[PDB]
Amino acid sequence: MRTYTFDQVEKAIEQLYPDFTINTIEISGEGNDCIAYEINRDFIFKFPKHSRGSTNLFNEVNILKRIHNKLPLPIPEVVFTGMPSETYQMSFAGFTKIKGVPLTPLLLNNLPKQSQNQAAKDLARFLSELHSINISGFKSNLVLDFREKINEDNKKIKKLLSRELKGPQMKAVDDFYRDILENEIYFKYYPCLIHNDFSSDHILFDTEKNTICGIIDFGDAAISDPDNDFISLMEDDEEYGMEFVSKILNHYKHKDIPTVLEKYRMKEKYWSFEKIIYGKEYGYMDWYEEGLNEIRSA
């Protein structure tokens, strides 16, 4: 897990942007795969902490360039890029900063009812448009084979938990992966471009106007199941209401809400296994054990 000083940052940007003058630089945030720097108050540079993060940062750039000016909400625009470097595909990238503030669930709930309603509508419209983008020219590296994903998870966890669980408790998971793979509802969907990390901290809001005014962070975006974009928002007490998103599903014209709820219920259970897998890949020994604890409890 890599780390950067302000200087290392300034100098990587100079390297390939010799005419670019850096007046101000502060840290804008940090996630599991990039550190974000706010530069000259106008740009957001993302620097990857590992290979996977660089690949996501590469995929984000590619995707933002290709859906530029096709959506009903502003999205960041790519202006700077870095370059491959051994392991890393990307190395950094600079996006325009979209002014605005996260549509936090607290912010949302403090809003007038009509303003809550207009937000649900605007989100609905955005996803409707996003999910309608023609997907013909996307390569495979951007497609998400869900069943392959579950199959490869099932292998990683069988290896991890072989040192952690006795037979009786291990059948409970073995049973859970089987139940999943046998249920077509997860695999039989009409695939489309999805944000795939669509939640409150990536939905920007303009309090002067009282309207959503940006959508950010396309690093996970991919060709996958459109229902994933509503599941991301449904967690009560952490994300938006289970009641708010049902307003979104309704402006969107969803024809099977019970299936979304069924997929949500499964993703909720699946979270423990992702903790175990990512806890081990990042080194987060606290993610690992907490996901492990959750499983000992099945």
Side-chain angles (χ1 to χ4, degrees), residues 1-158 160-236 238-298:
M1 275 264 321
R2 189 170 185 169
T3 184
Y4 306 84
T5 54
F6 283 115
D7 246 78
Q8 293 168 316
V9 178
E10 292 193 53
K11 72 182 162 235
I13 303 172
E14 279 170 51
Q15 239 203 184
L16 44 243
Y17 292 92
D19 311 300
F20 185 46
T21 299
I22 297 150
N23 303 313
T24 57
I25 185 165
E26 53 207 346
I27 292 186
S28 170
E30 179 172 358
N32 292 304
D33 65 53
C34 297
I35 297 165
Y37 303 82
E38 185 177 313
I39 304 208
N40 299 350
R41 296 291 296 163
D42 282 335
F43 303 107
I44 306 291
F45 285 74
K46 289 185 193 202
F47 277 78
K49 299 193 272 178
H50 43 75
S51 292
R52 188 89 288 119
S54 209
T55 282
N56 285 346
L57 177 61
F58 180 90
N59 290 163
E60 179 177 14
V61 156
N62 169 286
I63 285 166
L64 288 173
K65 293 214 215 228
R66 90 161 82 210
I67 66 184
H68 187 254
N69 285 358
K70 298 191 166 194
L71 296 175
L73 294 169
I75 69 226
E77 160 166 7
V78 181
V79 27
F80 303 81
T81 59
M83 287 199 307
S85 114
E86 312 157 295
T87 0
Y88 295 23
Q89 270 204 272
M90 242 307 153
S91 109
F92 72 76
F95 313 88
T96 58
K97 174 194 181 180
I98 292 184
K99 315 297 175 169
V101 123
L103 189 43
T104 219
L106 179 58
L107 191 48
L108 170 59
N109 187 66
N110 291 346
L111 253 33
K113 250 298 128 58
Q114 64 146 108
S115 265
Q116 293 196 195
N117 287 165
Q118 193 57 67
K121 190 171 178 186
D122 292 352
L123 257 358
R125 183 205 54 208
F126 175 90
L127 289 172
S128 164
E129 290 268 83
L130 178 57
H131 290 163
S132 294
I133 285 182
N134 193 320
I135 219 59
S136 298
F138 292 58
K139 287 182 143 62
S140 80
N141 66 116
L142 302 163
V143 189
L144 216 145
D145 189 347
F146 194 55
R147 167 175 276 133
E148 166 83 286
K149 131 106 179 178
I150 298 299
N151 276 332
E152 223 158 2
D153 289 6
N154 188 178
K155 294 155 192 167
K156 303 193 190 138
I157 104 148
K158 244 215 133 290
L160 270 352
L161 305 178
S162 62
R163 291 193 164 199
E164 298 278 9
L165 258 58
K166 290 281 170 184
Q169 308 96 67
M170 176 66 145
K171 201 209 49 167
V173 2
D174 276 324
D175 282 350
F176 175 61
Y177 269 89
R178 210 190 50 251
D179 286 337
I180 291 180
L181 294 160
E182 282 177 353
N183 192 2
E184 286 318 292
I185 227 190
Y186 310 116
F187 310 106
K188 188 179 172 168
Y189 57 83
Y190 299 96
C192 82
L193 180 61
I194 69 166
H195 182 280
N196 202 33
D197 191 19
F198 199 65
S199 56
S200 59
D201 258 19
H202 310 303
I203 302 164
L204 297 185
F205 183 91
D206 184 327
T207 55
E208 208 61 8
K209 261 176 274 222
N210 254 43
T211 55
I212 296 160
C213 63
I215 297 304
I216 66 172
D217 301 325
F218 291 69
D220 285 358
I223 289 140
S224 188
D225 182 350
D227 285 353
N228 282 352
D229 277 347
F230 308 88
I231 295 158
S232 334
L233 293 176
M234 273 166 73
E235 227 257 67
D236 252 292
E238 206 49 50
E239 289 300 334
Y240 298 143
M242 209 117 154
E243 162 167 288
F244 181 67
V245 330
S246 27
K247 294 176 189 174
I248 304 180
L249 296 162
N250 290 125
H251 291 271
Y252 186 83
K253 268 48 183 304
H254 209 288
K255 295 313 177 190
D256 199 15
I257 285 148
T259 281
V260 187
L261 241 140
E262 179 168 4
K263 295 170 170 179
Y264 173 73
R265 272 180 282 111
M266 188 273 332
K267 191 183 137 193
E268 218 192 24
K269 292 173 97 107
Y270 209 68
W271 193 232
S272 316
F273 301 88
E274 310 265 41
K275 295 200 218 191
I276 284 185
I277 287 178
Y278 298 136
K280 208 55 173 185
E281 293 182 354
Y282 292 148
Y284 303 5
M285 284 312 170
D286 58 290
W287 262 30
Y288 185 73
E289 51 178 1
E290 142 181 342
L292 194 65
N293 244 322
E294 289 162 22
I295 287 158
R296 294 188 157 130
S297 312

